[PDB]
Amino acid sequence: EMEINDHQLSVAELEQKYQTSATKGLSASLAAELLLRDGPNALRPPRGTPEYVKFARQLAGGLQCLMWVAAAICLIAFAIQASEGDLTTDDNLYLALALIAVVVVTGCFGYYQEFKSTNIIASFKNLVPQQATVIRDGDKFQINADQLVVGDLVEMKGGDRVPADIRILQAQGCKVDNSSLTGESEPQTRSPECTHESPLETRNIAFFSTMCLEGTAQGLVVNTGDRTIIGRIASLASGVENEKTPIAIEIEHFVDIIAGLAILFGATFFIVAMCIGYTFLRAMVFFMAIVVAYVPEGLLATVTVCLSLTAKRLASKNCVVKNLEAVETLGSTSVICSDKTGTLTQNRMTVSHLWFDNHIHSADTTEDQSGQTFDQSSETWRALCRVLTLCNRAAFKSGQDAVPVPKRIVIGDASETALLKFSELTLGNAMGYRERFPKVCEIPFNSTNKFQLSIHTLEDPRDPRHVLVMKGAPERVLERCSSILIKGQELPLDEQWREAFQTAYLSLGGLGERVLGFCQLYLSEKDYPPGYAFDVEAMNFPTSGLCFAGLVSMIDPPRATVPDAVLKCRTAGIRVIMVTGDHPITAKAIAASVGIISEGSETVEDIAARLRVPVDQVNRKDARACVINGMQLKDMDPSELVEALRTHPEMVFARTSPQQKLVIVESCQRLGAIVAVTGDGVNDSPALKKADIGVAMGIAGSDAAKNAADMILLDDNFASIVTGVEQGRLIFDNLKKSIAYTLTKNIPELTPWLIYITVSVPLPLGCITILFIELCTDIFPSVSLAYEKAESDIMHLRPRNPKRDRLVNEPLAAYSYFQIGAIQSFAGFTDYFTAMAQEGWFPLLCVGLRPQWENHHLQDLQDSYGQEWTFGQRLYQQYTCYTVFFISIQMCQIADVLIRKTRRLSAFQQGFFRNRILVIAIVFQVCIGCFLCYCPGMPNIFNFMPIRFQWWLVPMPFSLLIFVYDEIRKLGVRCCPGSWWDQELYY
Amino acid sequence: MLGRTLSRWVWISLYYVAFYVVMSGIFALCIYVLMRTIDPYTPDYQDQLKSPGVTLRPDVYGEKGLDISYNVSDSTTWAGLAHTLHRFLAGYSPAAQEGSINCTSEKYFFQESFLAPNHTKFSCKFTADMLQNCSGRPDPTFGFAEGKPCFIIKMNRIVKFLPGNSTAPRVDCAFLDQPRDGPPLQVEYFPANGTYSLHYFPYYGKKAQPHYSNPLVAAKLLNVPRNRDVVIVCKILAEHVSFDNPHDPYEGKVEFKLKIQK
Ligand SMILES: CCCCCCCC/C=C\CCCCCCCC(=O)OC[C@H](COP(=O)(O)OCC[N+](C)(C)C)OC(=O)CCCCCCC/C=C/CCCCCCCC
Ligand SMILES: CC(C)CCC[C@@H](C)[C@H]1CC[C@H]2[C@@H]3CC=C4C[C@@H](O)CC[C@]4(C)[C@H]3CC[C@]12C
Ligand SMILES: *[C@@H]1O[C@H](CO)[C@@H](O)[C@H](O)[C@H]1NC(C)=O
Ligand SMILES: *[C@@H]1O[C@H](CO)[C@@H](O)[C@H](O)[C@H]1NC(C)=O
Ligand SMILES: *[C@@H]1O[C@H](CO)[C@@H](O)[C@H](O)[C@H]1NC(C)=O
Ligand SMILES: *[C@@H]1O[C@H](CO)[C@@H](O)[C@H](O)[C@H]1NC(C)=O
Ligand SMILES: *[C@@H]1O[C@H](CO)[C@@H](O)[C@H](O)[C@H]1NC(C)=O
Ligand code: ALF
Ligand SMILES: [K+]
Ligand SMILES: [K+]
Ligand SMILES: [K+]
Ligand SMILES: [Mg+2]
């Protein structure tokens, strides 16, 4: 039913099938019944998951669930302790509130991370027309398109969209453009003749939401609503699984790693606390504290902020992303499936090659006129330019003087527009030149002539001679021609000249070009006076014995930056596949021109032609290039499709439907590859939705393509693709560095709790201090690492392996946690013991002191000097220990942010101060720490004490040790690139 | 062979062991240097010991704070408090004060040289009999049997802390909420007026004075109503002792709830 076979059926068979008539139409009652049974002729929008449901989903995950459990434990402990009258434990309630706030803020950041600002349904809704002329039991009337049913009479008034899938019954010069189906704006003739077996290629089928450019036609409704071709395209675009981006996958991977390690640590130390003697309440509080200390509370927010900064930097280069996760996926992309028309080409016919003086010239086709021109110093060239300027019917819109010539708005056909633009570019003023040469006679390209000819008058008033100019198909011109202009001389045509012309025509047409022949004949005033009545219907024009001027060919040329961008992408290890709805010859020519097919590469057909052998005997492995059209693609199984993809590294797909583009993209994705799709069309929208990264053009892109894509090229540069690949690789490396910096500090805040539990020293670090470290002091230094430059030439590297290469891997985690956090913990404990000993508590006395230290019924505890202490004084000393450990972590994190700038290069080589953002972040961190330490009231509000400068200075040697150790490790990695050192201590 | 082969595991484990041994050695060296820098007699800083804390005996504790309750008609509610006072004063018995010497200067006992045995400083002798009636020798109930309990009040010792020598530091006990119609608390002090002699200060440390004993003041509560929830605050009246600290209720003063049933 949905598949159209009605183009293959006769009119009577169609009438019997649809219970309708070609002339009368339906009856009102039966039309109403069919409308009731089928539904309206409208695209049904599939509603997606709501925003509140998505945001609630953002409040779940490993880290979110861990923080929720910790907050629940805090609330339970507070509630139990409140029942016993121990009201001095408001810290548990405050910590639970802080954890809830952290969860909510992280959920908000995650929602911002994946937010989409595109509504693809509206774009398809605007494509649907609202008027449809219908004939129901006679009495032709006009209604809305939604009230159309399968089998119904409709009139095709020119300038209106087709209101349904319609099989043409009668047509009178009707012409449409199937741009929403093919990506091509070329007008298509519609006639009641089945010219092809496929409904997408036949001439007797019109398609829903397609413009009728000119003419009138009548037809019978075949499909309505979602059963139409455009309805299926819209359903396919809307109904695609929202598969996770690579950055989302990596984030989930390291979140699972962190959650598993947190569960392990908390569980084993809960068991240890229970075993060595502790209440279940105390042990669960210990589990909460361990989870809070280990889990990075601001990691996801920092990742989102880094993505936002990269997005801002990308938007500074005319490249906007619909969601933040798109800023990375263009890096690590291994395959680019690219549209041709409007994406690689300019979507505008341009004069490319000329054949005059027995030589083929190449005209500059760049939109900025920056390419190399051809020779324009021949009398034959001047004659040919005069012919092509005079044989112009295209009109120019006034007021376009400042508009660049390629961007001008021209009223005329595509070929006429191209010829007039070429005349404007080469010759001074085409309209002026045509004005100085009035046309006494003119024969339009109406019909039955197959050429355009006009008779003009010489510009010079002293010459009453007339010049006749002719333009048409090359062979038609050749049979009319009798001589050829060579080097400004008229030479009679002979066998050699005819053979040369035929060879040039064949070679020029083999490059997917639209060749047109031009010729001229100088008339005489004796034959026709200047005031002669050149009646068009009088046949008075002789149109014989003309002189050939030359050949002009036109193509939709590539954009100026496209070849270099493709070359750079292929240098970066990315495979570029060309998928287009255009004809195979033009597709192969454009692929060769833009670099998708490299010089020297040959297809199986090319090899067969060169070796004068049938294609079946040619080995497929010899051909580096291959072109597959839609027929072969639909006949091909998935196994043969993947076999062809693996066999031919240079692949071009031509004359493909949107479904076939989707099939190619999914086939590439099923091979474990990150696939990028660049398109600017409604036919491109499903592939754009399916691709991991979908890129659309700004100006040339349609609304459906822009809504389906998650990256828009505002200026249509197509070098922004190279920019995005570079920036994605950069952000991957910088995210590695930032996550390492964030992770390294979780160990120096977890070790104090384990030591406190096991050896019963007074508590060295508090949960509030841990939260301050996580959320206030170190967020900016970690975010500032996103401005790091590339250490090497990342554009000469191959794309990363999605399975092998992870954002956070075992070397990174092991180094960051153990090697660095161990030094940070040693610094913190050295400072802790120093601060304790300066106040009278020696380390040996500190060992096992916790039960007496935290005893409220013990107000005269003696220190190492015999001085007796109250509980409040001991608590203030404990807050001093908190602040000392905090400052040690701060200094070690300054050293860490210094060493995280490079993964392989030296800090001296990359420059200490080249990252002004990093320097400002370090200064801000130090200032915030100083404010926290020395603001009045901090001891009672946040338990921060004014510490002495010696406790600022103690962790500095440890920070220096961190810097020196990382420098030595990187030096060894550089010096020995394939040793055990490089294998094991590189991340 | 998980992740890496067995030999690679050996090498990486050996590297981590060497790394952690080096780091532990660095930490031990830092601790050793710190302990060599530490002064064995005087602490480097006393930032948390600006004012001494005050405790008392007996120290039965409620959940909210110090709370003492007993019944004069029931001897079971008295034995614990009497035993606590006895075991506390056992350390102040004269057999335990042998290492100390008799002091009569009534002024700061400044010592700049180690003239006592063990190369130590001299410490002054405080015997339990200096608490006369509340010493427990003539009355073993410590006043709890007649409804006039004795409370021993001592201030925490701080090295080189001087409470002020214009007059000896004094203990003053009074009701926290002064009753309008009720008479004020009447307390008899042992020693007379409840003063700590100035020759017990300065405290020089555990190494310098291994036999140092905190001077004691016994507060005999005379005028206490029965079957009432009274609250008594005892503070130290010294020039350099401050009791105005909201965060530390035990600094320079001690507050307890008393309830004498009948
Ligand atoms: C998975 C791998 C884990 C590896 C962990 C490291 C294990 C080894 C680390 C430490 C072990 C003990 C090292 C002790 C070094 C002491 C050096 C020393 O000779 O000093 C002498 C002092 C005694 O002096 P005194 O009393 O005579 O002085 C009196 C003052 N005067 C002299 C002025 C009169 O001896 C002392 O203090 C002894 C007490 C020292 C304090 C130890 C308290 C335990 C705390 C441990 C926390 C460590 C956390 C590590 C975090 C690693 C993260 C991965
Ligand atoms: C070091 C002394 C004090 C204790 C020795 C304990 C041993 C058995 C422990 C402590 C440190 C541990 C290592 C710490 C880090 C790593 C890197 C990781 O990617 C694989 C496991 C590995 C290699 C661990 C293996 C087991 C290990 C060597
Ligand atoms: C004190 O003890 C007596 C018994 O010796 C008892 O009767 C009395 O109720 C107790 N005091 C109070 C008021 O609880
Ligand atoms: C310390 O001095 C005391 C004084 O009584 C003496 O009993 C003891 O033996 C001495 N100990 C040492 C080790 O000198
Ligand atoms: C304490 O004992 C002495 C000597 O027996 C006596 O004089 C004094 O009055 C007693 N004080 C009180 C109030 O019991
Ligand atoms: C108190 O001690 C100071 C020295 O700190 C001394 O000068 C002064 O005379 C002393 N006053 C009294 C009353 O003993
Ligand atoms: C302190 O006690 C003595 C008796 O030793 C007495 O003479 C003096 O007046 C008392 N001081 C005060 C302030 O009552
Ligand atoms: F513009 Al196309 F296939 F070439 F959509
Ligand atoms: K943490
Ligand atoms: K997509
Ligand atoms: K996708
Ligand atoms: Mg296109």
Residue numbers in the entry:
A (entry chain A): 47 to 1033
B (entry chain B): 29 to 290
What text appears in the publication on this structure?
The gastric proton pump (H+,K+-ATPase) transports a proton into the stomach lumen for every K+ ion exchanged in the opposite direction. H+,K+-ATPase contains two subunits—the α-subunit, which transports the ions across the membrane, and the β-subunit, which helps in membrane targeting and regulation of protein conformational equilibrium. The α-subunit contains ten transmembrane helices that constitute the ion-binding site and three cytoplasmic domains. In the lumen-facing state of the pump (E2), the pump selectively binds K+ despite the presence of a 10-fold higher concentration of Na+.
The E936Q mutant exhibits both Na+ activation and reduced apparent affinity for K+. Since the E936 residue is located more than 11 Å away from the K+-binding site, it is unlikely that this residue is directly involved in the cation coordination. This suggests allosteric effect of E936Q mutation at the cation-binding site. Mutation of E936Q is introduced on the background of the previously reported Y799W mutant, which induces luminal gate closure. A grid was prepared in the presence of phosphate analogue AlF4 and K+, and a 2.5 Å cryo-EM map stabilized in the K+-occluded E2-Pi state was obtained. Consistent with the local resolution plot, the bound K+, coordinating amino acid residues in the cation-binding site, and the E936Q mutation itself are well resolved, indicating that the model is highly plausible. Indeed, when the two structures were aligned according to their TM helices, the RMSD value of the respective region was 0.38 Å, indicating that the structure of the cation-binding site in the transmembrane region is very similar to each other in the two mutants. In the Y799W crystal structure, E936 located at the TM8 makes a hydrogen bond with D824 in TM6 (2.8 Å), while the E936Q side chain is slightly further away from D824 (4.0 Å) to form a strong hydrogen bond in the Y799W/E936Q mutant structure. Nevertheless, the valence calculated from the distance between K+ and the oxygen atoms participating in K+ coordination is 0.85 for the Y799W/E936Q mutant, which is lower than the value of 1.05 obtained for the WT, suggesting that K+ coordination in the E936Q mutant is not as compact as in the case of WT (see distance between K+ and indicated oxygen atoms). A speculative explanation is that the change in the hydrogen bond between E936 and D824 alters the position of TM5 where D824 in present, which subsequently affects the rotamer conformation or position of the E820 side chain, which is also located in TM5 and involved in the K+ coordination.
